[PDB]
């Protein structure tokens, strides 16, 4: 079976994970893992309780690894066990992927050095200190690396991955079975299309988190510079 | 606080629940419940383990109720306790909503009689026996009833609900914070746009489930006819 793994950490943004999980779990001959330090409950940033299925030590070699984002990314960027596990898996994985601020975890792990990548718009300035070439695009592919932003990015690149792992007809079948055709009632999903007043409110609400993440990012970068 | 409740049942299609959950949980002064017969683990059709937070008896009066879909809908259409709970909450809820085959549960509960509604394309013929006026549209609103199609239908109508519960700027802010700017890599999310061959693979794969659900629907309709 194709082995697909999501990192499941405290304060994950659960939809970053649960979207691609449901798409990829629809495919034949796949096994999907939710990975943490040990199996058991892990609480998402909303309070929704998820369950990790495998420990780092027991996880098989993965064909696909996916790092979701969320407020828990800050701690994960300085979790040496988690970063080492991600590096080990990335060394052999066909696909290394992330959603939203999950790419900052890839960055802290050293996996974005010289690589084109994106992240959540409010945190995009944190890519360059981690060695990345920052790109303002919703999905960015560099070799075996896909980084995406948005709560359907992982669903979308899951359909791309499905087409490459299997074939286009299989990806189309999953899309049709899920009747997946988003049609948002507003056009505020990018800082370039949202009203300026909404952008400002979002920036102000993110300011304390960004400040703390600047500090974390600098320590993570120092470890890479060593 | 505004009380929002999702029915969490065995064999749910978890993304039908987890999408709108993460959107609505981003709003101020909301409380979001995952409802089942008692708190504890409930397993989605993919094998993902979720946790119900409240029992039927302890659930507060809901301002929004949302019924997700999934394999597990068949059993729920003949679960008298669940159907009666849905009816009791729907009687006083500001909004009664469903995703995908969750509308078949609303139908079995008697809540679609004379109402315009949609459901998953492969099961759409089951609406009329439940008293509904079937509508081939991705979202269908009849008063305070909203039924949507597609595994991510609930994210979108969650943004509509956010705008009506609060204001448009709040919904736009949540959209921007989540960087929700969907962009599927294929155009097969409707039987009207997917390749005819893919539509057939999907119809054939659904045939046994539809057959079983025709039987269930007829029994559910008989209970309404009494
Ligand atoms: Cl998105
Ligand atoms: Cl959809
Ligand atoms: Cl807008
Ligand atoms: Cl269960
Ligand atoms: Cl297509």
Residue numbers in the entry:
A (entry chain B), B (entry chain A): 2 to 227
Text from the published report:
Our enzyme of interest is isocyanide hydratase (ICH), which catalyzes the irreversible hydration of isocyanides to N-formamides via formation of a cysteine-derived thioimidate intermediate. ICHs are commonly found in pseudomonad bacteria and soil-dwelling fungi and likely serve a defensive role against isocyanide natural products produced by competing microbes. Asp17 is catalytically essential in ICH, where it is proposed to act as a general acid/base. In addition to its intrinsic biochemical interest, ICH is a useful model system for catalysis-activated enzyme dynamics.
By contrast, G150T ICH samples this conformational ensemble at rest because of steric effects of the G→T substitution at residue 150. Because G150T stably adopts a state that is transiently populated by the wild-type enzyme, it is a useful tool for studying how ICH conformational ensembles change during the catalytic cycle. The movement of atoms along “softer” internal degrees of freedom in the enzyme is further supported by comparison of a cryogenic (100 K) structure with the 274 K synchrotron and 298 K XFEL structures of G150T ICH. The cryogenic structure superimposes on the XFEL structure of G150T with all-atom RMSD of 0.45 Å (Cα RMSD = 0.21 Å), and many Fo(synchrotron)-Fo(XFEL) map peaks lie in the direction of displacements between the cryogenic and XFEL structures. Despite having nearly identical overall structures, isomorphous difference (Fo-Fo) electron density maps calculated between the 274 K synchrotron and 298 K XFEL datasets for G150T ICH showed features that aligned with principal axes of anisotropic ADPs and with minor shifts in atomic position between these higher temperature structures and a cryogenic (100 K) structure.
